[PDB]
Symmetry: D2
Amino acid sequence: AKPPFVSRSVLVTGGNRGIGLAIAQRLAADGHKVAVTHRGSGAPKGLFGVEVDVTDSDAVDRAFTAVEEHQGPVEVLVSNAGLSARMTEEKFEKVINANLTGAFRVAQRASRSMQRNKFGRMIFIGSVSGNQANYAASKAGVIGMARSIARELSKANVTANVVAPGYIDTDMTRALDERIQQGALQFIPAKRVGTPAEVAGVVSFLASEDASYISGAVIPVDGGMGM
Amino acid sequence: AKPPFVSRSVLVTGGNRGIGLAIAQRLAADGHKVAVTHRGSGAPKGLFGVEVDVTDSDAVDRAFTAVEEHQGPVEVLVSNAGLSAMTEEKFEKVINANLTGAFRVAQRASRSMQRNKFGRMIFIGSVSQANYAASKAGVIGMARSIARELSKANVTANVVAPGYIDTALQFIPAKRVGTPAEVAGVVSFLASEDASYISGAVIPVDGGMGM
Amino acid sequence: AKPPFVSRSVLVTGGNRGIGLAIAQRLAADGHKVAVTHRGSGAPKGLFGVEVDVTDSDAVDRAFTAVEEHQGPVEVLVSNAGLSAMTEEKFEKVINANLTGAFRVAQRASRSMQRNKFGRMIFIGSVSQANYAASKAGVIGMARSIARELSKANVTANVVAPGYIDTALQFIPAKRVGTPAEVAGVVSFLASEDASYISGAVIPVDGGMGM
Amino acid sequence: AKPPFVSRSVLVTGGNRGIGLAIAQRLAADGHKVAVTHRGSGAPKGLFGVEVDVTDSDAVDRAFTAVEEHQGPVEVLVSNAGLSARMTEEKFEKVINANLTGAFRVAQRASRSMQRNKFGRMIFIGSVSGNQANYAASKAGVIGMARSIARELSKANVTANVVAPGYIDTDMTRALDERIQQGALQFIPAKRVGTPAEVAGVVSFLASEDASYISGAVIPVDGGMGM
Ligand SMILES: [Cs+]
């Protein structure tokens, strides 16, 4: 007794690259109407692209307006980490503004339409493993924020969940010392890195009709690492 | 890309009523080969059934053998609570059915999963007593131990933790109770090819309740 | 919109080998409840099986009853050729198994389908003899008669006409033989909720051969 | 053992209205990248639109080029009837040019890329029931053409099939005399009209990986009418 599929208006922030790209392509093949944000390079073929820096509340507003006009109001928001990568105030605030406050900005802009239409799915994608304290603070902060949103908006059938990837095969992970790669594996029960498609599949589920009674959850996609 | 579907040999314990029944029916509609255990009331129409008291290790063993003969070795094990829902007797009865029972079915499933380098163990928490709380938290610790040991063999162990399901609302952000189908959909996902890199997780299906 | 999936009670005759087996396995992975008939070699692992000689009307009747008891009344009937693949004896043997056999299973299925206002009869033509040609064309005429009478009750009858399937290429535009999975996919569609307004059709699955 | 889904670049001619719209929406929800042609009014939200009159070979060429640039070369072509609706030469040639020659033009423009990439699905949608001789000639002509294409191109994994709808619920069918509506039913074993979604489901199948060994076929979607 599987709920019938509904084609949703989807916005995937940072959806032209890496894990964000895998997510956007998967949601498109699922049957959804998928738009992505980017910082200039553009969306790949078959996806509607809008340029926006998530540190800029006006650019966020214009992005959502453009998507609304293209494919209808955003029903499923996938917020990917704006940045991924001793410590200092500038580096701390830069990461917080992009990854935590940036997540707030897109969630806030999505919320009114989601509440009004009594449907919404906010799905926040944590930054990858693995600048320690700034990324740690922003990722944990997004989880606290998502829980607050879930507590406020779940009564309107608007949920907010977090996908927490562990070590995933990306360009930066492959650039890491051969020595760091094989020994990150010592912390991972699965004894292998995850793939972008493995993250995308979990997002596919959270966007689907099957995830309606999940709200305020953090689903780790990490081969057991974070236990 | 979305990974190709694989029809799995599935066993759902307590798969004849309530949430277990919803899970069994959903996994069958997904395309899996679904067997259930039950305590006497019989299996649902269409599905292979075996009578098991999960406090009985011998009965668990002969159930798995019967299922292997019918549809092949169990690849996906869904362990539903033996009891729903303080004396030493009541405490021990719930621990034996809900915690040790989970161990019995997990242990019996484990050899074949490890050998074939594929397994999904999915434990379903009871709906919501020191006894029930201990057994539910206990199963989570057990699952995490199994995930730590066996994830390297592509054998994962995850928990679905339902809140209030209809088979009080002030404490639930959704302002409604969940349905058995809403639990079943999460189990469908965890049984699927899309859940391969999830292990040792507890997924709450509670409308935000236990956040 | 795409109509919601419904898990149907399916019977596939000759569903234990070749194209029939591929059909049965595909329909089971689709989410249906799949039973097969066979002539002695047994059913595939996982699926409910009944021994039927389709020249025997009594054996057909007791097969349908056994299937009804197991998984509910047959909603989707897939009739595969009794024989694969000139004397009066050889002619009559092929007609009796392939044409009259199709009638026997169709007739037995028809009452319940009409009563419940749902039925899909799907006849699978033999792969490619005056006897075989007569029986294959005969089944098409029979199916068309059934479709004319019963489509008003949401009971349709369609034919899949395979060409050369691997269980010569110069006469095939595709320049290759078809696979059993390629036949099974067409049967999956005809069993689905998307085939509701198709009735009395013959769908060739032949890479262009019989065009 | 179902073939894994592949997201195809789809062009549905006349895909902004009626049966064509139902087809385009279904193929989009299936997971494909769907573009439609129209004659000016535009594509609905979530579908890429291009304007083209299928009597104009240059406009067809430009349409396919625009789709190619948007979503990749056309892999699945759904050619819907340009026109639907005593007899005279002008009315005969008008319908032949739109419905038969128009089908040729789009098939021809699709063919080279399909052959080169060793994949293609041409799906021709016959005009609805039910100007007699011109529509009859064009619909039968499209079937002969499709069979020729199937004979030539099936060796390159390029197939050509026809969906032949009977009486389907559309704006024009509903405009027909109450008396003609209920008595068209006397010719239909199903004893009801079909829906646009019933046609779209058959097109979904013909576009899918399950239809690979079907070529040169005419699938009637008519509740048994045309037996
Ligand atoms: Cs099944």
